[PDB]
From Swiss-Prot:
The organism of origin for this protein: Homo sapiens
Main location: nucleus
Catalytic residues identified in the record: 132
GO biological process: DNA alkylation repair; DNA repair; methylation; negative regulation of apoptotic process; positive regulation of double-strand break repair
Effect of residue 145 to A: Reduced DNA repair activity. Decreased reactivity with O6-benzylguanine
Name used for this protein in its record: Methylated-DNA--protein-cysteine methyltransferase
């Protein structure tokens, strides 16, 4: 599992994608014009990811046409409420949609685990790809975000919600 990295510039700042032949491991935000990945080439999960992010930001209308790379981060290798949460979020909530913590909890098999769900969100190694930014309060409020409220709001405004891009 030899780690490979590449960085990509985005409207959110520099993104560091890391992965192996078996799958994308992480997307990390290091902090108007589409940019290329600093290092071109494989492994495949990294090319898929970079292609996916470029579309998400600059070609959103076509986001569904891009394959979601295979994930190989430790959290996905073994079972856990955290994995079940991340996967459920990944496969269910799409571009423009939001979900409350309670709905995600129930979706993961336990309606009373909204808190554990909120916790599982901080353990997401691949933000944006796995839309933890779409998990919001049932009150209508945006809610907490591991990467800062401002980023969460940007992503949401980016997907159509009536919030100004901070
Ligand atoms: Zn790996």
């Amino acid at each position: 599992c030899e780690m490979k990295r590449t960085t990509l510039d985005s409207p959110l700042g520099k993104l560091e994608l890391s992965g192996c032949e078996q799958g994308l491991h992480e997307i990390k935000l290091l902090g108007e014009v589409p940019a290329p990945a600093a290092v071109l080439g494989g492994p495949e999960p990294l090319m898929q990811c970079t292609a996916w992010l470029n579309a998400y930001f600059h070609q959103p209308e076509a986001i569904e046409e891009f394959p979601v790379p295979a994930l190989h981060h430790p959290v996905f290798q073994q079972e856990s409420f955290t994995r079940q949460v991340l996967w459920k979020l990944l496969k269910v909530v799409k571009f423009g949609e939001v979900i409350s913590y309670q709905q995600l909890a129930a979706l993961a098999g336990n309606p009373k685990a909204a808190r554990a769900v909120g916790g599982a969100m901080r353990g997401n190694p691949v933000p944006i790809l796995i839309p933890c930014h779409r998990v919001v309060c049932s009150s209508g409020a945006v809610g907490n975000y591991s990467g800062g409220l401002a980023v969460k709001e940007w992503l949401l405004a980016h997907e159509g919600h009536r919030l100004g891009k901070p």
